[PDB]
């Protein structure tokens, strides 16, 4: 029994983290095969950061301008180039600890594990969701840039996030591992803000199913609803629209618990309109939206990553 | 910025998890140097649940009755002994992945990371606290016994928990790595029940200091309290007594934020009286008690916001 916000085991990614120094800046890199990936803003001064021309800044750098430490051994950079907002540093040695991996770009609402790192040293691991407004509600201090986010699907690590910056409201923005930002952000010191966020409806439903599976049933009721009717309610409460694909994805949980998705939607409608009346669900007084349907199924079945 | 339930990177522990099989029972073991640690109830049969005599069960076993598998490799068991409620299986290979480590018994309120495992392979990592009633609120399915909890200081893994059983309320009980249970529990299926649980007051105060550090002051007030008056109030809400030890422990966070410990106690008193009135603290609508003072200092900046 029990339900906890759970990260993937981080060992396979820990073996890939390195320290990258350029000038006075140190941050983290991801060492896979013979390339180290890190944010291209590592090459900027604070003045550069105000309006950078990254190609122009890069051409003045030599391979030897990039100090890369894997643990306590230096890595020899032998080439350098950019792909979108990530710098690719070719090194003379393949990482012997490279896991089976892919670069994937995730959708808003999808979750992933973040391995927060400082000076190439992993320091903590936690679970995030890509918010509808394309930020993540992370926990990052100075020096964490280049920390990565990932899922594990078999023995394959799917890298999906590189940390780049913190927005004024304290949430975070980054890229996929091909250097494409999530969200309407740029790697420049200029006025930027998170857009208004919304709640991930299909994930809240997943968590309600998790709650039922764990014996928390007080919010269940006799009523059901329709998609159109429910989506009117969702829109009024700044919840994302629930689509038919969402319903299909929740199918397994509906069959296992005996609560059809629109049956559960009626529970959620009543919770939105009336609150929780002093009660909690899985120990929370808020409706939790950073568990995907897959997260709930995985944690409520015991899937492992040897 | 940000504040998350953050676990330690699990890779150092991942490299120690093995599968231990005895008869029809399979569970997890912890392989350090040439010893595999696991719950002694692995030797119990279906008749042995209520009043096992472990000395009598164990003396009937030979080294080759224990099957230990590390990844795809069988390890050879060359010795076995019982220490309290853990079995120590001596094997013919030192684990080449053994980290720097120690065994430490923790006190209620202390936090640690759990690497949930099944069949010797890690599933997920999350953060737990030893409750005042010596249980933990984990996420554990059948086959998770022998999963461990740990902290990592620098590069040294401190193992502090081994998972043994789930109590009827769905909370979890286990031992330190010397096999001594936390709390009054025993490895028998005789009826036993967790004591009423209480809130870890010093941790709530730590977390309120975290909120101030990340820039939230809305819950402070102009008042203070004596330590004894605080405790008289807080225990009416099922909060643990706050000791002078706890007040001393909070000194650093008090100095960093400029809010005296007993002034923060006054804020807590008001929060218990008033609730949050539709507001949140660090993203929660409930007061959080599974962050220790040490956790807050490790995760938060050293510079308080405003
Ligand atoms: C002071 C400053 O330049 N802040 C800043 C702003 C945006 C981005 C991006 N992307 C990165 C930074 C940096 F410097 F913290 F790396
Ligand atoms: Cl302790
Ligand atoms: Cl909450
Ligand atoms: Na219903
Ligand atoms: Na293993």
From Swiss-Prot, chains A, B:
It is found in: Host cytoplasm; Host Golgi apparatus; Host nucleus. Residues 1-306 are cytoplasmic. Inhibited by pyridone-containing alpha-ketoamides compounds 13a and 13b. In turn, alpha-ketoamide 13b (tert-butyl (1-((S)-1-(((S)-4-(benzylamino)-3,4-dioxo-1-((S)-2-oxopyrrolidin-3-yl)butan-2-yl)amino)-3-cyclopropyl-1-oxopropan-2-yl)-2-oxo-1,2-dihydropyridin-3-yl)carbamate) inhibits SARS-CoV-2 replication in human lung cells. Inhibited ex vivo by michael acceptor inhibitor N3. Inhibited ex vivo by compound 11a and 11b. There is a cross-link at residues 5, 90 (Glycyl lysine isopeptide (Lys-Gly) (interchain with G-Cter in ubiquitin)). The active site is at residues 41, 145. It comes from the Viruses. Changing residue 49 to A: Does not affect ability to cleave and inactivate human TRMT1. Residues 1-306 form the Peptidase C30 domain. It catalyses: TSAVLQ-|-SGFRK-NH2 and SGVTFQ-|-GKFKK the two peptides corresponding to the two self-cleavage sites of the SARS 3C-like proteinase are the two most reactive peptide substrates. The enzyme exhibits a strong preference for substrates containing Gln at P1 position and Leu at P2 position. 3CL-PRO exists as monomer and homodimer. Only the homodimer shows catalytic activity. Interacts with host FBXO22; this interaction promotes the proteasomal degradation of nsp5. Cleaves the C-terminus of replicase polyprotein at 11 sites. Recognizes substrates containing the core sequence [ILMVF]-Q-|-[SGACN]. Cleaves and inactivates human TRMT1, preventing tRNA guanine(26)-dimethylation of tRNAs. May cleave human NLRP1 in lung epithelial cells, thereby activating the NLRP1 inflammasome pathway. May cleave human GSDMD, triggering alternative GSDME-mediated epithelial cell death upon activation of the NLRP1 inflammasome, which may enhance the release interleukins 1B, 6, 16 and 18. Also able to bind an ADP-ribose-1''-phosphate (ADRP). This is 3C-like proteinase nsp5. It comes from Severe acute respiratory syndrome coronavirus 2. The chain holds residues 3264 to 3569 of 7096 of the full protein.
């Amino acid at each position: 029994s029990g339900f906890r916000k759970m990260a993937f085991p981080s060992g396979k990614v820990e073996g890939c983290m390195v320290q990258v120094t350029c000038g006075t800046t140190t941050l983290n890199g991801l060492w896979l095969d013979d390339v180290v990936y890190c944010p291209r803003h590592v090459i900027c001064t604070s003045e550069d950061m105000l309006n950078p021309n990254y190609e122009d800044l890069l051409i003045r750098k030599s391979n030897h301008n990039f100090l890369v430490q894997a643990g306590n051994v230096q890595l020899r950079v032998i080439g350098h180039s950019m792909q979108n907002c990530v710098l690719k540093l070719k090194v003379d040695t393949a990482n012997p600890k490279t896991p089976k991996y892919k670069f994937v770009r995730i959708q808003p609402g999808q979750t992933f594990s973040v391995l927060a790192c400082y000076n190439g040293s992993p320091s903590g691991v936690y679970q995030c969701a890509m918010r509808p407004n394309f930020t993540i509600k992370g926990s990052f201090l100075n020096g964490s840039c280049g920390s990565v986010g990932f899922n594990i699907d078999y023995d394959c690590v799917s890298f999906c996030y590189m940390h780049h910056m913190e927005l004024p409201t304290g949430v975070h923005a980054g890229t996929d591992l091909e250097g494409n930002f999530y969200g309407p952000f740029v790697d420049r010191q200029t006025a930027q803000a998170a857009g208004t966020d919304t709640t991930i409806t299909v994930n809240v439903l997943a968590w309600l199913y998790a709650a039922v599976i764990n014996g928390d049933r007080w919010f269940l009721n006799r009523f059901t609803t329709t998609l159109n009717d429910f989506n009117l309610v969702a829109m009024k409460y700044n919840y994302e629209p629930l689509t038919q694909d969402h319903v299909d994805i929740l199918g397994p949980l509906s069959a296992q618990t005996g609560i059809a998705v629109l049956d559960m939607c009626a529970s959620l409608k009543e919770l939105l309109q009336n609150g929780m009346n002093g009660r909690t669900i899985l120990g929370s007084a808020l409706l939790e939206d950073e568990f995907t349907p897959f997260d709930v199924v995985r944690q409520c079945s015991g899937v492992t990553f040897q």
